[PDB]
Design an enzyme around this catalytic site. Structure first.
Site, PDB file in Angstrom:
ATOM      1  CD  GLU A   1      12.223   6.090  -4.610  1.00 43.92           C
ATOM      2  OE1 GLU A   1      11.136   6.705  -4.741  1.00 43.92           O
ATOM      3  OE2 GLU A   1      12.414   4.942  -5.068  1.00 43.92           O
TER       4      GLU A   1
ATOM      5  N   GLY B   1      12.320  -3.486  -7.850  1.00 44.00           N
ATOM      6  CA  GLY B   1      12.677  -4.865  -7.560  1.00 44.00           C
ATOM      7  C   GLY B   1      12.979  -5.568  -8.868  1.00 44.00           C
TER       8      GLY B   1
ATOM      9  CB  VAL C   1       6.312  -7.924  -6.344  1.00 45.51           C
ATOM     10  CG1 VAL C   1       6.609  -9.330  -6.813  1.00 45.51           C
ATOM     11  CG2 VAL C   1       5.180  -7.313  -7.170  1.00 45.51           C
TER      12      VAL C   1
ATOM     13  CG  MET D   1       4.639  -0.480  -5.701  1.00 47.42           C
ATOM     14  SD  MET D   1       4.500  -0.476  -3.873  1.00 47.42           S
ATOM     15  CE  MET D   1       2.732  -0.298  -3.681  1.00 47.42           C
ATOM     16  CD  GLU D   2       5.855   4.327  -6.501  1.00 51.88           C
ATOM     17  OE1 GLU D   2       6.862   3.844  -7.072  1.00 51.88           O
ATOM     18  OE2 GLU D   2       5.551   4.042  -5.327  1.00 51.88           O
TER      19      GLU D   2
ATOM     20  CG  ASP E   1      13.634  -5.606  -3.882  1.00 51.61           C
ATOM     21  OD1 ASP E   1      12.737  -6.439  -4.147  1.00 51.61           O
ATOM     22  OD2 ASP E   1      13.524  -4.377  -4.114  1.00 51.61           O
TER      23      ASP E   1
HETATM   24  N1  LIG Z   1       9.514  -5.776  -4.823  1.00 54.94           N
HETATM   25  C1  LIG Z   1       8.946  -4.539  -5.143  1.00 54.94           C
HETATM   26  N2  LIG Z   1       7.657  -4.484  -5.497  1.00 54.94           N
HETATM   27  C2  LIG Z   1       7.113  -3.302  -5.807  1.00 54.94           C
HETATM   28  N3  LIG Z   1       7.770  -2.122  -5.789  1.00 54.94           N
HETATM   29  C3  LIG Z   1       9.099  -2.175  -5.421  1.00 54.94           C
HETATM   30  C4  LIG Z   1      10.056  -1.207  -5.288  1.00 54.94           C
HETATM   31  C5  LIG Z   1       9.862   0.260  -5.526  1.00 54.94           C
HETATM   32  N4  LIG Z   1       9.203   1.185  -4.602  1.00 54.94           N
HETATM   33  C6  LIG Z   1       9.738   1.156  -3.430  1.00 54.94           C
HETATM   34  C7  LIG Z   1       8.547   1.551  -2.478  1.00 54.94           C
HETATM   35  C8  LIG Z   1       8.375   0.343  -1.545  1.00 54.94           C
HETATM   36  S1  LIG Z   1       6.935   0.380  -0.410  1.00 54.94           S
HETATM   37  C9  LIG Z   1       7.476   0.731   1.256  1.00 54.94           C
HETATM   38  C10 LIG Z   1       6.461   0.850   2.239  1.00 54.94           C
HETATM   39  C11 LIG Z   1       6.798   1.123   3.559  1.00 54.94           C
HETATM   40  C12 LIG Z   1       8.144   1.280   3.920  1.00 54.94           C
HETATM   41 CL1  LIG Z   1       8.425   1.615   5.602  1.00 54.94          CL
HETATM   42  C13 LIG Z   1       9.183   1.163   2.931  1.00 54.94           C
HETATM   43  C14 LIG Z   1       8.839   0.888   1.595  1.00 54.94           C
HETATM   44  C15 LIG Z   1       7.464   1.811  -3.246  1.00 54.94           C
HETATM   45  O1  LIG Z   1       7.406   3.182  -3.573  1.00 54.94           O
HETATM   46  C16 LIG Z   1       7.660   0.926  -4.481  1.00 54.94           C
HETATM   47  C17 LIG Z   1      11.228  -1.852  -4.879  1.00 54.94           C
HETATM   48  N5  LIG Z   1      10.970  -3.115  -4.780  1.00 54.94           N
HETATM   49  C18 LIG Z   1       9.688  -3.364  -5.097  1.00 54.94           C
END
Ligand SMILES: Nc1ncnc2c(CN3C[C@H](CSc4ccc(Cl)cc4)[C@@H](O)C3)c[nH]c12
Ligand SMILES: Nc1ncnc2c(CN3C[C@H](CSc4ccc(Cl)cc4)[C@@H](O)C3)c[nH]c12
EC number: 3.2.2.30
Lengths: 229, 229
Positions: B12, B79, B153, B173-174, B197
């Site tokens: 990011e 998301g 989520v 998540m932040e 997403d």
């Molecule tokens: N459906 C969702 N729920 C919560 N947070 C997010 C996010 C935002 N951030 C992206 C990121 C996803 S966690 C993750 C873990 C391992 C790997 Cl290898 C790739 C991604 C987090 O910092 C929350 C996007 N969609 C989300």
């Protein structure tokens, strides 16, 4: 020598300020009120972070960066997950986990976050010191894994999950974040907890009753540790 | 003028370092790597906190206390919780909530923690600036409440809960922790997010595909803001 003492609630650090009985200068910063004082030879900074992972992370980071504490001792209460941990029992955390972290959607084990670890370690030196003391005072000091999340656990279904998944002995809402911050800055951390309930359907009632007492038991032991430092 | 720019993942903030193209000195601290640089007249500190409430709280607190940033801009992906927020859409958070905080056992509304508040506010000055810009660039900038928790989520049941309970538009998540820390220290904060997403059963697949693009859209807009400061 600079030492930080944290509590989550005011009710958890009030006894600490009493027991120490020295003059505390009050320094406000970032929404927290830090009590700076002097004990024997050591410089002590006390404070309550407020509830939760976010609050506790802020305060611990502030304590370390703003006051430069060289050690961090936490003391408060917790909910018992095991049959052999009874109300008012004392426990010192060996490992802490954030039980509410869930990236399973990315085929990750629960509690794991990339670039980190599921279990975080606490000071082996301090945990030893606590065992020494708990031994001379004839106190039944237990030890184990503590689970931390932003939910107040009051139900058997969660109890079991926590024990099976992480093999936890007690639950609370700030232990893991404090240990985590301390680890990232290289500060030895010790997390003491006193049992205030059993995290069951009745957890809420019991908590209200023993908060005050449990907070004291915990506060007393920590004082004895600070005396030995 | 000191400005902090945060990201959760390296993916990011990489585009942010590119887009700025200046020489960044690398200062490590507390497990994070801060990139200090100079742009036009402003001094910019960039970094990725790592994933989650705890990580993001640590870094934000460090940024503020160690570097003394006077403003904080966050940029990353999220998301979508609503039908009118499509992949790659931009959003700027008006209020943030920690959707996973639960003290219901103490007859507290979800997301509430004593001595705090359920919704936390972001800079009205910065959010205005973003609206101005999104207007000149002919960009469809949306705005709303962002939900934050330590769970990824990926399920409709949670989607609905979040929208009904908190009236949220996007999840990540932040966001809430950054805004929270900034609020406690009096630092204006702006949280930009790009849709990666729909937080559904397929959320994981889609996330993997658009991460890279969504991160860019977000990064581009933030640069334009830093240009106007
Ligand atoms: N459906 C969702 N729920 C919560 N947070 C997010 C996010 C935002 N951030 C992206 C990121 C996803 S966690 C993750 C873990 C391992 C790997 Cl290898 C790739 C991604 C987090 O910092 C929350 C996007 N969609 C989300
Ligand atoms: N079953 C349990 N689950 C999680 N944490 C705890 C703890 C430990 N801390 C006590 C404290 C409980 S939350 C609360 C909210 C409003 C009011 Cl008015 C009184 C108490 C938190 O800092 C976690 C004891 N039992 C617990």
């Amino acid at each position: 020598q600079k030492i930080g003492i944290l509590g989550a609630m005011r009710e958890e650090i009030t006894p600490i300020l009493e027991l120490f009985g020295v003059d505390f200068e009050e320094i406000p910063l970032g929404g927290n009120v830090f009590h700076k004082g002097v004990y024997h030879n050591k410089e002590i900074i006390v404070a309550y972070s407020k509830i939760g992972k976010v609050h506790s992370t802020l305060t611990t980071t502030s304590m370390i960066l703003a006051f430069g504490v060289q050690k961090v001792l936490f003391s408060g209460v917790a909910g018992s997950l095991v049959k052999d941990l009874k109300i008012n029992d004392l426990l010192v955390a060996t490992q802490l986990v954030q039980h509410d972290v869930d990236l399973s959607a990315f085929d990750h084990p629960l509690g794991f976050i990339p670039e980190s670890a599921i279990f975080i370690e606490t000071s082996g030196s301090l945990n030893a010191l606590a065992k020494k003391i708990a031994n001379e005072q004839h106190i039944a000091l237990k030890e184990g894994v503590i689970a931390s999340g932003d939910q107040f656990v009051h139900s058997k279904e969660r109890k079991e999950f926590l024990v099976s998944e992480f093999k936890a002995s007690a639950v609370e809402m700030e232990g893991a974040s404090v240990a985590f911050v301390c680890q990232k800055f290289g500060v030895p951390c010790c997390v003491l907890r006193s049992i205030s309930d059993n995290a069951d359907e009745k957890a809420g009632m019991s908590f209200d009753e023993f908060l005050e007492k449990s907070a004291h038991t915990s506060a007393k032991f920590l004082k004895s540790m600070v005396d030995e430092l």
